[PDB]
Amino acid sequence: VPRGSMIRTMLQGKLHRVKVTHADLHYEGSCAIDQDFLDAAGILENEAIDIWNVTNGKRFSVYAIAAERGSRIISVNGAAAHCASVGDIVIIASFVTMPDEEARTWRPNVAYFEGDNEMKRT
Amino acid sequence: MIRTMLQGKLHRVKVTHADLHYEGSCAIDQDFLDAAGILENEAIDIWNVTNGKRFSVYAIAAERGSRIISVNGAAAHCASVGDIVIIASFVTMPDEEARTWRPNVAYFEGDNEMKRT
Amino acid sequence: VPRGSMIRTMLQGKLHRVKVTHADLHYEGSCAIDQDFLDAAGILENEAIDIWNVTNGKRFSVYAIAAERGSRIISVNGAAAHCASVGDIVIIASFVTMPDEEARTWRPNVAYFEGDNEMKRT
Amino acid sequence: MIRTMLQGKLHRVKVTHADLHYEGSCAIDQDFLDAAGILENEAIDIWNVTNGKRFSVYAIAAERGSRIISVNGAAAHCASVGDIVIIASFVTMPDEEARTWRPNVAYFEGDNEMKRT
């Protein structure tokens, strides 16, 4: 309300420059991300995510499940292993929808990475 | 805030038919649609394990037990008969529900035999 | 209601196998579709549409505005002219969202084409 | 039923910066965001007239009057400085409203000069 309000698609959070740690094309299962990283970016298990590959430029859509907390895992499995490889630097983002007013004051959850998937607030 | 969540996935089915010239839609055995919660005419993503292509389309139901995965029309440029593919659909819901949501996943081997019981 | 209902993305309608009639990369303006065809497929002016190119396999997302009724126009303009050319056979679809119950009994608006963009119900 | 509608578009801007290695986001002059109704952190599509590539990302605001169109991070693989691109965002609303919706379109020439009055 107002009913019929125009709804925006906004960046909810992203993991900026994580490094892919595992990639298995033949995997019977999902992509996975350390739960600590999900938490920092506000990303949920089984939430749609975009992955934008800094190393090779590929851009694709998938979902991930939680890897154990503290594992530092970024696993890109199944068909998505044709789009990322271990060592590649990627950006992982999720988007949510909300009405325009809320969108204009929204602050995304952004976590920045370096080194061995070490996470910084800024 | 509204989240986009995996609703369900058919993991590792084989394309059985692919007709570029079809006057009609892609089709999936209704038993596989049933297992993954995927509806006739719902938006689906198809991720091709054999060639890496990733595309979006929709499917209607094929006859139960036919094991059909048919990728027709323009989509026949992105998969061929015998390719292994992963098919998923996504739904939206508020954050509060999405935190406990569980998707429907079905796994397959061989000639489209669903790992079942 | 129930509040929080799971919302599906469903095919609202499509134009099956129309032929692209104009394509201008340098165009200051939009893609356009004869209003009669929009009407048959339930597609709106300025609605997001997917175009799946049967001739060259490209798949892309755009929007169109109404061309004059009866012109039989399918015009693919701007950057999208790198994805379709005059003569190419394409499928144009739109998707809408709705709750799961409604989705299970939804019937999309499908119009089939042949010849000089002559439209049939079946 | 909920429709996805064009909210607004920047038609024919030139990319002014493209840094693959950026610790940060794509950026657009706030005056251009203002003209097309596009928000900081909103999902946008970028359609590259010069090379045909089409991708999705988001942007934050660049300084007013800077004329900046900066395509950074992985997206720097899809556009270069001097490419002409079209940037759009989409919103959703019920069918009843979408029937009369009007998007915000701004047209440009030259060095990112918005056709204005």
Author numbering:
A (entry chain A), C (entry chain A): -4 to 117
B (entry chain B), D (entry chain B): 1 to 117
Passage from the reporting paper:
Aspartate α-decarboxylase is a pyruvoyl-dependent decarboxylase required for the production of β-alanine in the bacterial pantothenate (vitamin B5) biosynthesis pathway. The enzyme catalyses the decarboxyl­ation of aspartate via the formation of an imine link between the α-amino group of the amino acid and an N-terminal pyruvoyl group. The pyruvoyl group is formed via the intramolecular rearrangement of a serine residue to generate a backbone ester intermediate which is cleaved to generate an N-terminal pyruvoyl group. The activated protein therefore consists of two chains, the N-terminal β-­chain and the C-terminal α-chain, which includes the N-terminal pyruvoyl group formed from Ser25.
To further investigate the role of Thr57 in activation, we determined the three-dimensional structure of the T57V mutant. The T57V mutant ADC crystallized in space group P6122 under similar conditions to those used in previous studies and was subsequently cryoprotected using sodium malonate. Three bands were observed for all site-directed mutants other than T57V. Initial analysis suggested that Thr57 is required for activation, as the T57V mutant cannot be catalytically activated in E. coli at 37°C. Ramjee et al. observed an increased rate of autocatalytic activation of purified ADC at higher temperatures. In this region, the structures of both protomers are similar to each other but in both cases are distinct from the structure observed for the WT zymogen. The hydrogen-bond interaction observed between Ser25 and the β-amide of Asn72 in the WT zymogen is lost owing to these changes in the torsional angles of the chain. The presence of bound malonate in the crystal structure leads to displacement of the unprocessed chain. This means that it is not possible to determine whether the observed conformation in the zymogen is owing to the hydrogen bond between Thr57 and the carbonyl of Gly24, but it may be that the very lack of this hydrogen bond is critical in allowing malonate to bind. A structural analysis of the zymogen reveals that substantial backbone rearrangement occurs as a result of the adventitious binding of a molecule of malonate in the region of the unformed active site; however, there is no evidence for ester formation in the protein, suggesting that Thr57 is required for the formation of the ester intermediate.
